[PDB]
Design a protein around this nucleic acid. Structure first.
Lengths: 559, 559
DNA sequence: TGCATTTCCCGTAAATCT
DNA sequence: TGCATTTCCCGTAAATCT
């Protein structure tokens, strides 16, 4: 939806469109008058070799009118240029930069709308206006060549008008070249900006100046680790080469809007080994999953007498060799994008920024709404801020460092916050998908606050939550059944590993768990999912000559 | 252990060794006499320019003696050559060829002893004898150059003696070049002669002529699909290239005997795609797993004035792209090696030979004793010949075709004999390993003959056997418990898939299977493994603040 | 050494051949 | 089309780096 700032932008772009038409009009008038003047002059000389009365006066008067039309045109052109310069900045430095920011956010699972359509229409309109304006300026030049005098408006301003129009266009083209789809392995659509060597990844660029004349004209060359990974910048770092079809012609193929774009598929990265390097300094100068790289795109455009070098790059990418490095790699991409809008700070992790629990929590919810249908409730969310910040009320300004979020292991645990959490999402995906869908799982809640169930709610009322001690990820629940109940003895079984969920699903465990009590009688999977809902309405939906005797496995607690 | 034929061989090789020493002796005598004759002659001429009485007689007599010694040497050399020619054939065409045959057999799991030691000692001894013999022959030549006459034994025979010795040596060197370790992926040690593109494989060659002078002198080049896959032979076939270190210098490294050998590791195959081919005719001219290739080794030896081109090749190899093709690929390697001793018939599967149940059964047992501690009992073996040949008594001359063994699916099944069986072995490996070890599993027995248990043995007596209907492979057992037993109602549960064995082991199923009968009471895992052994002595060996409630899964038949 | 990181390769699933 | 065959790539385990 349009904001007011975009409203004005569209408005101004139209005013510019209008002015250019008016000037085009004014150019036609001055040309015709110049032709009329030229013929009249010719006719007058071709006889002054008897001079018709008043015709000399007409010639002189035509000339004066020409002069004035020229002065006029030249100052309206200058004013237009200044307005193009002002608005172009709004277009490129404000609206386009905003898009790039929201693209970062969309990569890490945030509210999208990274649609380039409006921007492309804006950019193309401005570009057309600039090129037509340059054509009028070129025309003024050829008008001066046919007719000129001492104090000619064209001779004393035109060069500056040309310089300004060319600089504007040149810069507009360069801003227009962007990475529409950031590097991502199609196999891990929710993990853009993380590439594993040997696995195909794809990326796409777009030129927001929609000029049909340029269809199939430009050749885009992509590479990784250019320039800054040749002379000055980072050190100790690994270096890679892109393998696969290195170049790609830009065209209007997909036809959606017929926008100029170039898509690269089947790309692969391979470490460039041997030679001379270092690995000097601390952390071997950043661990593998914290090292950042840039994929660059370059091309040259020769358009209407101008040569313009276009270049753009991806957001920093983390390169891994094995998939087991992805959780950590992702955390890096989260932190980077959550905390900065600089598109090329590869040394970011030398001294990472600190985030607030606010921004960290949002980002965390996104991670869930991406892979699943819904994110995190503040019950599960707030009990998470506790697992990091300890006791308290409200967590807005509470600072979360990179070390706390992922770099170092949690309190007494032998794993990091992010990794434990990523492993959970992977569990909620490979199994328990819809079983997590609606509001089913409490998921995250302290053994403590896991008291406000059977101990306030009738015996039977159970819970659905994750194993806090498990690195790989595991699941569990609630129920009061063992010995002579004192004042409601709350319980949980030992969490089920990813393999343990191959043996029987969770809502199947929940609606197929009797509990063989000391009495030798298998008692019961407690009723009422926490609030007051009998297990059935929620969990019942996911449950299910001489022949071999069909069987089905169950564990159901042994005592 | 030495056979009588090998005894004679060793004997003859020694006789040859002896003769060469005797001739070496005879050469020394003739040389000295020639020197004596030469000096005497010199001395006699240097004065006949008065001649000492009787000295002319001595000179003449020395000459006659020389002549006779020469005739003698020349005929003993000829006889020796004929004996070297006879024995060499026994060495190379009989004993070495036998080794190659038993190497084939060892590849497909048969009784090994493919030790090259004896052969290498035999070959090296003969080679040394031949080279020394050639040196005596060369010497005869330089003796003739210093002293000769009309009718000289050396001039009229020596060229033929040279030709024969060189031909013998040349052929001995060529026979001596062999593939000691056939192409095999170290990852699948029991599957030699089957290579999957992209996976490393290793192979090794040996030169049985143990000459230290040649250490590090020869460079061996390996390749696949040479010559015959350039011009005349097979058609429609795929073609490959060996990637990795293509050449390898031959040396005496491992030092075990210090035998000359060249080992190639880290080799990889890749399909050579594009160009011009065909895939014309039926079966696209043999399916992938029936297509055969040869890996060739070549080198040149320049030794004591001779240039000898050595070449050897592997046994035909089947090339696959995915591991799922290995069962079929192996069957091909089994059939080939079980039925022929031709080392290079790549068109074998155009018209495969027929085997007898005898040879087919042996080979089948081998497949078990390879991967496990023991093969197949005739109970399990004979009940197998029934699954292929139907009813009968004795199966010796019963022909088994390639189609019956593997090419076409079994009777009413949607899979082939070999594949079902290979899948079983893979099951007996990944799980139930020792649980198969001793004599535990009956494994293969008709539902029919699976009557001679509870129905002749007390109720309780169970069985251990494989799923006949399962492609992927599965397992099952015996027990009489359901309703009011009539006259012993024999039973089996639905077989456990490879994944079903991750849920609980077989001897754990067997000693943890109660059977919840209609009476709501889980009854019992029947006692006495078939003969009369209470399940325990055999199967019992493989069985095994606020804490989470430790659990353990069981299926135990639901009725 | 123990650790960080990369390589190997099965087995499954998707892709391409034919 | 449906099939034979090859390619893709995770995830585990072994290997190499440092």
């Amino acid at each position: 939806v349009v904001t007011e700032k975009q409203q004005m932008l569209e408005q101004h772009l139209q005013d510019v469109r209008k002015r250019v038409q008016d000037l085009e009009q004014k150019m036609k008038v001055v040309e015709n008058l110049q032709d009329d003047f030229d013929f009249n002059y010719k006719t007058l000389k071709s006889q002054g070799d008897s001079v018709t009365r008043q015709k000399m006066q007409q010639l002189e008067q035509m000339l004066t009118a020409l002069d004035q039309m020229r002065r006029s045109i030249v100052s309206e052109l200058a004013g237009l240029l200044s307005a193009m310069e002002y608005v172009q900045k709004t277009l490129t430095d404000e609206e386009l930069a905003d898009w790039k920011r929201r693209q970062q956010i969309a990569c890490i699972g945030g509210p999208p709308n990274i649609c380039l359509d409006r921007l492309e229409n804006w950019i193309t309109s401005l570009a057309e206006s600039q090129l037509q304006t340059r054509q009028q300026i070129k025309k003024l030049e050829e008008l001066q060549q046919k007719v000129s005098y001492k104090g000619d408006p064209i001779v004393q301003h035109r060069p500056m008008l040309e310089e300004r129009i060319v600089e504007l266009f040149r810069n507009l083209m360069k801003s227009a070249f962007v990475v529409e789809r950031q590097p991502c392995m199609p196999m891990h659509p929710d993990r853009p900006l993380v590439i594993k060597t040997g696995v195909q990844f794809t990326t796409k660029v777009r030129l927001l100046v929609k000029f049909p004349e340029l269809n199939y004209q430009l050749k885009i060359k992509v590479c990784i680790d250019k320039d800054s990974g040749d002379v000055a910048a980072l050190r100790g770092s690994r270096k890679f080469n892109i393998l696969g079809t290195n170049t790609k012609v830009m065209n209007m193929e997909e036809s959606n809007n017929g926008s100029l774009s170039a898509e690269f598929k089947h790309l692969t990265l391979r470490e460039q080994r041997c030679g001379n390097g270092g690995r000097a300094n601390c952390d071997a100068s950043l661990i593998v999953t914290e090292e950042l790289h840039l994929i660059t795109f370059e091309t040259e455009v020769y358009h209407q007498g101008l040569k313009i070098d276009l270049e753009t790059h991806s957001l920093p990418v983390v390169v891994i060799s094995n998939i087991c490095q992805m959780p950590n790699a992702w955390a890096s991409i989260l932190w980077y994008n959550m905390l900065t809008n600089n598109p090329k700070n590869v040394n970011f992790f030398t001294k990472p920024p600190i985030g607030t629990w606010d921004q960290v929590a949002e980002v965390l919810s996104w991670q869930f709404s991406s892979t699943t249908k819904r994110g995190l409730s503040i019950e599960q969310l707030t009990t998470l801020a506790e697992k990091l910040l300890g006791p308290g009320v409200n967590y807005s300004g509470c600072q979360i460092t990179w070390a706390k979020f992922c770099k170092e292991n949690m309190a007494g645990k032998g794993f990091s916050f992010w990794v434990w959490l990523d492993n959970i999402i992977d569990l909620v995906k490979k199994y328990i998908l819809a079983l997590w869908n609606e509001g089913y799982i409490m998921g995250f809640i302290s053994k403590e606050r896991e008291r406000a169930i059977l101990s306030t709610k009738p015996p039977g009322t159970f819970l659905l939550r994750f194993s806090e001690s498990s690195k790989e990820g595991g699941v569990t629940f609630t129920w009061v059944e063992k010995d002579i109940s004192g004042s409601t003895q709350i319980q949980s079984v030992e969490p089920y590993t990813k393999q343990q969920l191959n043996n029987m699903s969770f809502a199947e465990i929940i609606m197929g768990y009797k509990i063989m009590d000391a009495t030798n009688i298998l008692v019961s999977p407690l009723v009422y999912l926490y609030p007051d809902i009998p297990k059935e309405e929620a969990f019942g939906k996911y449950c299910r000559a001489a022949p071999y005797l069909k069987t089905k496995f169950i564990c159901v607690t042994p005592f």
